[PDB]
């Protein structure tokens, strides 16, 4: 749902290089 | 523009129309009044006129009010109110010291009434707000007249400020509009208004020219 | 505090520090701050020295 899309999309911040725990 | 006059509620009585009809009316004693102050734009920021009413012994009133009335140039009175106008031409009509009577109105002209409601005291929900109770038998547990469910569960989890529930009622200003006027008596200076108006016997009431349709 | 003083004296903090480094003066930020609150004339003299010591063009590829 909306909840799921947010965290996966928020992982694409250049700060974390794209790899984060828990997708 | 919008005429006004003070008065007092007296009671109820019947009057029969020329067409052989029946219409209950209220008797209002719009006693003579005086003008003590006028409000102008460059002085205050609005347009209105100040009135006074009531007969009081000089020793009753307090010294600052007595001094204000003396400076105005009239004898002391009991109550004071004002009528808010909308232009300067209208206020130009009124002058300090002028006397107004009930004649100003004419029969067949709709007006408005202002006053205070009765004193009902603290009351239950079903009475104050017209809730609907529940079954008085077939398995009650002393919930005959209490409302019941009040809100949601954990979402959001409050009482939604503004909910309708128990509390005191009455004792506040109430107004009614476009009331017909039946007859005017000059010698007695009393009004006959069709219908019922708010207030109590021997209370305070102010009547104004109709806005909605007048 | 140093940034405020330099901006008041019409020069940026980064350029001030660059000029100090070029001139080779090793005094510390606390000393600059105390001197500025105490001796505006000395602060102005130091700022002028730094500006003189600054290179020609800050944009040069050197």
């Amino acid at each position: 749902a909306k909840r799921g899309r947010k965290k996966r999309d928020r992982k694409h911040s250049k700060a974390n290089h794209g790899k984060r725990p828990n997708a | 523009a919008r005429k006004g006059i003070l008065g007092t509620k007296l009671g109820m009585t019947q009057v029969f129309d020329e067409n052989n009809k029946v219409v209950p009316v209220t008797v209002v004693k719009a006693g003579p009044n005086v003008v003590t102050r006028i409000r102008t734009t460059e002085r205050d920021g609005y347009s209105a006129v100040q009135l006074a009413y009531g007969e009081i012994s000089p020793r009753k009133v307090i010294k600052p009010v007595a001094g204000q009335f003396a400076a105005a140039g009239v004898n002391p009175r009991r109550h004071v109110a004002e009528l808010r106008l909308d232009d300067e031409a209208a206020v130009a009509e009124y002058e300090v010291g002028q006397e107004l009577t009930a004649e100003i109105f004419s029969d067949g002209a709709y007006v408005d009434v202002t006053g205070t409601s009765k004193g009902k005291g603290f009351a239950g929900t079903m009475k104050r707000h017209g809730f609907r109770g529940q079954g008085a038998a077939h398995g009650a547990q002393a919930v005959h007249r209490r409302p019941g469910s009040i809100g949601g569960c954990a979402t959001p989890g409050r009482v939604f400020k503004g909910t309708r529930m128990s509390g005191r009622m009455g004792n506040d200003r109430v107004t009614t509009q476009n009331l017909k006027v039946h007859k005017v008596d000059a010698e007695n200076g009393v009004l006959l208004i069709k219908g019922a108006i708010p207030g109590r016997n021997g209370g305070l009431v102010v009547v104004r020219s109709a806005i909605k349709r007048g | 505090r140093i940034n405020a003083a330099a901006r008041a004296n019409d020069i940026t903090y980064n350029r001030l520090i660059q000029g100090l480094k070029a001139a080779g003066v090793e005094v510390d930020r606390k000393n600059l701050a105390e001197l500025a609150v105490s001796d505006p004339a000395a602060f102005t003299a130091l700022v002028d020295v730094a500006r003189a010591a600054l290179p020609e063009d800050v944009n040069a590829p050197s």
Partner: protein, 146 residues
């Protein structure tokens, strides 16, 4: 030890800024920095060191883009379903100073230091002001080349 401000060493001053054909962001930034006193070399976070400011001719504020109708200022009274909205055009039409006051308020810390600070600002709509008896000093927004 490092210098600290004493009981009565602080001194204030009067400033006036015009708002004729200027950009709201720059005006707000300048006002905020002046309020905080960052320019003064006697800055200390714990005690205010701000300076008075006067803003004139708010109605002439210029805003770029289509923000005249696509930017909205929201607020809510508190009862359910009470969220009503207004547009910047109507806001300027009715209350010229509200936009600038809100902008400056948002441009400052929200703690009680800033709550006290916001007392330091007076904003007007017309080109005049009854505060001429205190001789305010004109000010101009400028950039330091580097």
């Amino acid at each position: 030890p490092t210098y600290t401000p004493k009981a009565g060493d602080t001194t204030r001053s009067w400033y006036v800024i015009d708002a004729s054909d200027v950009v709201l962001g720059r005006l707000a930034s300048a006002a905020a920095t002046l309020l905080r006193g960052k320019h003064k070399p006697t800055f200390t976070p714990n005690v205010d060191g701000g300076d008075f400011v006067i803003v004139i001719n708010a109605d002439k504020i210029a805003v770029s883009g289509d923000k005249l109708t696509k930017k909205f200022a929201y607020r809510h009274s508190g009862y359910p379903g009470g969220l009503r909205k207004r547009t910047i055009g109507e806001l300027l039409e009715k209350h010229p100073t509200r936009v600038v006051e809100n902008a400056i308020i948002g441009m400052l810390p929200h703690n009680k230091l800033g709550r006290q600070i916001q007392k330091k600002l007076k904003v007007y709509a017309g080109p005049d002001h009854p505060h001429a008896a205190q001789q305010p000093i004109p000010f101009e927004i400028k950039q330091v080349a580097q």
